[PDB]
Amino acid sequence: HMSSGNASWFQAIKAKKLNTPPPKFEGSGVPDNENIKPSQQHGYWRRQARFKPGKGGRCPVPDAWYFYYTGTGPAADLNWGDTQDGIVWVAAKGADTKSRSNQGTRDPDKFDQYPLRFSDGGPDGNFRWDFIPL
């Protein structure tokens, strides 16, 4: 239906300009989650290219990146650390990168988008994301 949905648990992080580089995170790079062990705070950022309706096919609007924990999501067969185009590897300090959760991916039918908080800092200057309640 939607990408083996596979909907990310958490709201996107849109990019500011076009041609923004892969995100730099200050600290963990890992969204705050109440239902998760400090040991299990690790995952990846996937770059999803967007388009706007228009003249030629469609229109390349700026990039976006979603969050999935290691072993969940459209690159779940990768170990944490695997170098790949379009993925940014993050993990909180002192986290079992050999562990795996069983949180999976958001079933958009419907667990609504999950608000993105980031107590240890956040992504760099080239990225933003809407405010969501809570």
From Swiss-Prot:
Residues 3-134 are annotated as: RNA-binding. Residues 3-58 are annotated as: Disordered. Residues 44-58 have a biased composition (Basic residues). Residues 5-130 form the CoV N NTD domain. It is found in: Virion; Host endoplasmic reticulum-Golgi intermediate compartment; Host Golgi apparatus. Belongs to the gammacoronavirus nucleocapsid protein family. This is Nucleoprotein. The chain holds residues 29 to 160 of 409 of the full protein.
